[PDB]
Amino acid sequence: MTNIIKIRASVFIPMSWTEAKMDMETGQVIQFEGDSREFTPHAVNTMRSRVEQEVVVDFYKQEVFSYANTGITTEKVISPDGSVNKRTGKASTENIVCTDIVWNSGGVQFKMSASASNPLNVYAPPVDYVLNVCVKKDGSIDVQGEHDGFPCFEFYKQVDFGPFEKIYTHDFRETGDTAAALGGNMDYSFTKRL
Amino acid sequence: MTNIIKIRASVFIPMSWTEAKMDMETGQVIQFEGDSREFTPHAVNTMRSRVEQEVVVDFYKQEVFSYANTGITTEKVISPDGSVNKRTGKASTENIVCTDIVWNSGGVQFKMSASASNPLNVYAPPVDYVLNVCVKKDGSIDVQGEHDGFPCFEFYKQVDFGPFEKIYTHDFRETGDTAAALGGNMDYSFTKRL
Amino acid sequence: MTNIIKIRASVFIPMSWTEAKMDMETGQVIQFEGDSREFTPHAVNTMRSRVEQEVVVDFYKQEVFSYANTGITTEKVISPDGSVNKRTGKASTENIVCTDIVWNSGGVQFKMSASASNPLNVYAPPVDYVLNVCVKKDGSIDVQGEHDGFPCFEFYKQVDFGPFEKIYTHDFRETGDTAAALGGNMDYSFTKRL
Amino acid sequence: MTNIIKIRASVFIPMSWTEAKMDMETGQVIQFEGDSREFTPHAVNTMRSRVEQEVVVDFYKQEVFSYANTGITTEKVISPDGSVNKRTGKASTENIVCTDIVWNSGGVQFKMSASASNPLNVYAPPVDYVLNVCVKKDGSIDVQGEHDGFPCFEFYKQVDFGPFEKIYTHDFRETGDTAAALGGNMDYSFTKRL
Numbered sequence: 001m002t003n004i005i006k007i008r009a010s011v012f013i014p015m016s017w018t019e020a021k022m023d024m025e026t027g028q029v030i031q032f033e034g035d036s037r038e039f040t041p042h043a044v045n046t047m048r049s050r051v052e053q054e055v056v057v058d059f060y061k062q063e064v065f066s067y068a069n070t071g072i073t074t075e076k077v078i079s080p081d082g083s084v085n086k087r088t089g090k091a092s093t094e095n096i097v098c099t100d101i102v103w104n105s106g107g108v109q110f111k112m113s114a115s116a117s118n119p120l121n122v123y124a125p126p127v128d129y130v131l132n133v134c135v136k137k138d139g140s141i142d143v144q145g146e147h148d149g150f151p152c153f154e155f156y157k158q159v160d161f162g163p164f165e166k167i168y169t170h171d172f173r174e175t176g177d178t179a180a181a182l183g184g185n186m187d188y189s190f191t192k193r194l
Numbered sequence: 195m196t197n198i199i200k201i202r203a204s205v206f207i208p209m210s211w212t213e214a215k216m217d218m219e220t221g222q223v224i225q226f227e228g229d230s231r232e233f234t235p236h237a238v239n240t241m242r243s244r245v246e247q248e249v250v251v252d253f254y255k256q257e258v259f260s261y262a263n264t265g266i267t268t269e270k271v272i273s274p275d276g277s278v279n280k281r282t283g284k285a286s287t288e289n290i291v292c293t294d295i296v297w298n299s300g301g302v303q304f305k306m307s308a309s310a311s312n313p314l315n316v317y318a319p320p321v322d323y324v325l326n327v328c329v330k331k332d333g334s335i336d337v338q339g340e341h342d343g344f345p346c347f348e349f350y351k352q353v354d355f356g357p358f359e360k361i362y363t364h365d366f367r368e369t370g371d372t373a374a375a376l377g378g379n380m381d382y383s384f385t386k387r388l
Numbered sequence: 389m390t391n392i393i394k395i396r397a398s399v400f401i402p403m404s405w406t407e408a409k410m411d412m413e414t415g416q417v418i419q420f421e422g423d424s425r426e427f428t429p430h431a432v433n434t435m436r437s438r439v440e441q442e443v444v445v446d447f448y449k450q451e452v453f454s455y456a457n458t459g460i461t462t463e464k465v466i467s468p469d470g471s472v473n474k475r476t477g478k479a480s481t482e483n484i485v486c487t488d489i490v491w492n493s494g495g496v497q498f499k500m501s502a503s504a505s506n507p508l509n510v511y512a513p514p515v516d517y518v519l520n521v522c523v524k525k526d527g528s529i530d531v532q533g534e535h536d537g538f539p540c541f542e543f544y545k546q547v548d549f550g551p552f553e554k555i556y557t558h559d560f561r562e563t564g565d566t567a568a569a570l571g572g573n574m575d576y577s578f579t580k581r582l
Numbered sequence: 583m584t585n586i587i588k589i590r591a592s593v594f595i596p597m598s599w600t601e602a603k604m605d606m607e608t609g610q611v612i613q614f615e616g617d618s619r620e621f622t623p624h625a626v627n628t629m630r631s632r633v634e635q636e637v638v639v640d641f642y643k644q645e646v647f648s649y650a651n652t653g654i655t656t657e658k659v660i661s662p663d664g665s666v667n668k669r670t671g672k673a674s675t676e677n678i679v680c681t682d683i684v685w686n687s688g689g690v691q692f693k694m695s696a697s698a699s700n701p702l703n704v705y706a707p708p709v710d711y712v713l714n715v716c717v718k719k720d721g722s723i724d725v726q727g728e729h730d731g732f733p734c735f736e737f738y739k740q741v742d743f744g745p746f747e748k749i750y751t752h753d754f755r756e757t758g759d760t761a762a763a764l765g766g767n768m769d770y771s772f773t774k775r776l
């Protein structure tokens with residue numbers, strides 16, 4: 001009846017630039033580039049997110065396909081001498097996976113997990129989410145998510161090439177949270193049936 | 195002839211506190227306790243070192259013994275309101291080792307490797323040194339070493355309970371190295387004969 | 389017959405920037421620009437000193453000449469949001485003087501006095517020195533000085549366009565000293581014949 | 583009709599301690615004692631003001647009397663190692679005065695000026711106020727005032743031992759000023775008839 005059902009996850013920083021840090025050792029002032037954008041599902045391959053993942057369940061084919069990416073990190077360093085210098089790196093995508101795919105008569109389930117650190121500052125703990133998602137042949141979905149409290153998170157489902165539907169969003173700046181929340185374990189969780 | 199020769203290794207931050215890192219938006223300021231001392235052989239069991247290691251070759255017993263230890267890590271956080279909060283942790287010694295001991299006619303060979311990470315940040319990079327030493331029955335040594343460019347490293351020999359003798363010292367505030375030098379590979383090497 | 393003889397005084401900050409001061413009221417970090425150099429006699433008119441003075445006694449003309457100058461003060465302010473601002477000002481030279489010139493049979497005496505404020509930091513007490521110098525007709529000098537403990541002080545002589553010769557240097561990081569030494573009385577003193 | 587008319591002025595810091603400043607050269611966090619009070623005309627002799635002044639015009643003897651005082655300054659310095667150390671001094675009252683008394687049948691005018699340094703810091707900017715007050719025989723007054731934008735300022739009038747009345751107040755924290763407003767010129771001014 002319904003053929004293709006896609007789940008999209010995005011992790012992004014809304015600001016142009018992260019919170020400024022100063023190292024008295026070097027005299028520098030450093031910040032990393034953001035994604036300069038609000039919430040939206042239309043940001044694929046746009047490089048306006050730190051982590052991006054899409055799983056596509058294909059019932060016609062009896063297949064799960066996954067797509068995983070990380071944005072580019074740019075650090076802006078202002079030297080004592082005043083000069084500014086940018087450096088570029090890209091997080092690994094080794095730990096953005098789609099795992100534990102299990103089939104039954106009327107659907108499939110799997111877990112999506114993402115862990116990506118900042119390639120240019122190693123002292124930083126990685127962002128993490130994991131969702132346990134169950135999809136039925138009818139089209140409706142059933143998700144159990146956890147994620148670090150920072151930065152912003154957005155999840156959408158899109159079925160048979162139609163319009164996108166909001167699964168769940170987390171807005172750190174509405175929530176009181178900060179980059180501290182990236183350490184520890186995954187502070188938040190949610191349940192959602194669409 | 196000569197019976198006991200000891201090799202001492204010591205890594206230390208000569209300041210009372212590491213140079214401050216500050217988070218501009220919050221005003222928060224972060225520092226790590228140092229060892230507040232200069233170069234000195236007599237620092238054993240004093241907890242004035244990040245890493246501390248002694249290898250004792252005993253020609254009279256045909257034996258090699260070793261001691262290894264880490265200092266305590268203290269994170270001091272100053273809040274915008276001048277409130278101060280401390281945290282304590284102790285790096286594991288699991289990777290301060292004396293390995294590849296080879297006994298032959300002329301004396302003995304072995305390699306001392308130290309690698310200690312920050313018990314308060316799992317993600318920080320570790321300090322590293324490796325020493326390849328060769329000790330002769332007459333009390334000559336031959337040393338080939340590598341180490342990170344930060345913080346301070348000092349190495350000493352002492353024979354038959356005699357005075358200490360400097361093998362090698364490295365002082366990051368002379369070579370202009372930084373806390374960054376704790377990552378990557380070991381960036382200095384040396385060779386010394388006593 | 390020795391013709392002309394020179395005394396050069398230089399007060400400079402060896403670092404590129406003085407050490408940060410932070411205000412939890414405004415959230416800001418402030419530093420002033422240093423002179424980014426080591427001790428050297430060849431620094432005239434390079435603007436690489438906070439205060440600089442040359443007294444020249446001419447035995448051919450029987451005259452004393454003096455040059456005096458201050459470098460430029462540059463204040464750098466980092467803001468909570470990582471913006472940086474510079475301001476700029478130049479200390480008055482009115483209080484860098486050469487004084488009480490007395491001539492006798494065998495040479496000349498005089499007094500070099502320096503006092504300079506920070507034009508951007510009124511909170512700054514002046515840097516201060518005074519040299520009492522006695523120059524014999526044959527190119528010998530007898531100097532007696534006082535100075536504040538911070539920053540660095542260098543004094544040289546130069547006879548008849550010859551090489552420069554060190555009279556006295558003060559290095560504040562060697563003698564464990566602080567910008568506090570700027571206030572109060574002149575902390576240090578010396579006498580030298582050369 | 584009216585015999586005694588008192589004008590009272592108080593300069594105070596509402597909070598227990600001024601906002602901390604940190605110095606990276608020494609690691610010290612340093613804040614000064616405030617007056618830990620809100621606005622109140624009843625604070626004479628209470629040592630809960632930096633500056634206090636009362637002028638009393640006495641229409642019965644035809645005399646103007648004046649009383650001037652500064653508070654105790656106390657700096658708390660927290661050392662990098664935890665230990666705290668207090669110094670105390672007391673600002674001079676040499677520049678809190680009442681001058682330019684001119685009498686006529688109608689009443690009297692005079693000027694009240696206050697300037698007071700921080701007595702541990704010679705070169706710190708004084709707090710300043712200057713009031714031009716006209717006192718009429720019927721008891722009414724007319725005041726043109728100027729003051730620095732920090733810290734807090736309260737002025738009151740009292741006739742024939744009656745209750746106090748507010749002339750004017752300045753709360754630097756409603757108006758978003760800072761300790762910088764201490765410097766340069768008196769940023770605020772006001773005019774009052776009551």
Ligand SMILES: [Mg+2]
Pocket residue numbers: 125126127128148182183184185
């Ligand atoms: Mg995490």
Ligand SMILES: [Mg+2]
Pocket residue numbers: 147148149181182183184185186187
């Ligand atoms: Mg967490």
Ligand SMILES: [Mg+2]
Pocket residue numbers: 341342343374375376377378379380381
């Ligand atoms: Mg290295």
Ligand SMILES: [Mg+2]
Pocket residue numbers: 319320321322342375376377378379380
């Ligand atoms: Mg390393």
Ligand SMILES: [Mg+2]
Pocket residue numbers: 513514515516536569570571572573574
């Ligand atoms: Mg001085």
Ligand SMILES: [Mg+2]
Pocket residue numbers: 536537568569570571572573574575
């Ligand atoms: Mg002094």
Ligand SMILES: [Mg+2]
Pocket residue numbers: 707708709710730763764765766767
């Ligand atoms: Mg003022």
Ligand SMILES: [Mg+2]
Pocket residue numbers: 730731762763764765766767768769
């Ligand atoms: Mg002002």
